[PDB]
Design a protein around this nucleic acid. Structure first.
Length: 209
DNA sequence: AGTTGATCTCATATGGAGAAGGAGCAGAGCGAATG
């Protein structure tokens, strides 16, 4: 029971570190490859005993390109997170001056909390993940090809090369599992590199909608 | 400027699949009123 919850927490942490590394936040190799017994050593083996508390699991990371661009990962203790908890995180983000955070929720989020993530979105970007959808890194699955988020300059070069408008690219939904993983917003473009049985390799581009 | 006549026209008699709307209803959370 605690042997199950500690395994879940470890897997979720591993996936979150992989996600942060793929978003380009500075993540050490040691924490990226931390084993289950090392997790038990650092945080504990009886989360029902409060060892760890899920408040202990919180992560803070900084971007490789700018040490002031920082992101939290929060693991709320309550199963169904309400607006009180979002307000607590908003306060903590305001005082630490952190604009991005991921909120990992065990069972869900209340309608009011969902709307509160929308209504603060320009200044503080809060994202919801279920813990279930973090128990496996979907980008390691064999059906999912390599996704690379493009820079604005690279999109301008793309559109200038093929002489096309953004609306002529094929789309990806902002709610797509992989778009959510990379955290890409409307109007960004993701380069996709996939093998092909007739050319050898093929690149395609999707505009987020 | 005045006169004729066809002709029209009224009126008389006796399977299934997906999508969309509504009601039920649970329950979040806001604000007033305590106690």
């Amino acid at each position: 029971d605690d042997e199950e919850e500690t395994y879940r927490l470890w897997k979720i942490r591993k996936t979150i570190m992989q996600l942060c590394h793929d978003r380009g936040y500075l993540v050490t190799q040691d924490e990226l490859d931390q084993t289950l017994e090392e997790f038990k050593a650092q945080f504990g083996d009886k989360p029902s005993e409060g060892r760890p508390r899920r408040t202990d699991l919180t992560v803070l990371v900084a971007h490789n390109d700018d040490p002031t661009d920082q992101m939290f990962v929060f693991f709320p203790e309550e199963p169904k997170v309400g607006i009180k908890t979002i307000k607590v995180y908003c306060q903590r983000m305001q005082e630490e001056n952190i604009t991005r955070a991921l909120i990992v929720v065990q069972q869900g989020m209340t309608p009011s909390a969902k709307q509160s993530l929308v209504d603060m979105a320009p200044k503080y970007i809060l994202e919801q993940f279920l813990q279930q959808e973090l128990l496996i890194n979907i980008t390691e699955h064999e059906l999912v090809p390599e996704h690379v988020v493009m820079t604005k300059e690279e999109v301008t070069e793309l559109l200038a090369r093929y002489k096309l408008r953004e609306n002529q690219l094929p789309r990806i939904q902002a709610g797509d599992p992989v778009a959510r993983y990379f955290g890409i917003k409307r109007g960004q473009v993701v380069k996709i590199i996939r093998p092909s049985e007739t050319a050898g390799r093929y690149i395609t581009y999707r505009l987020v909608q």
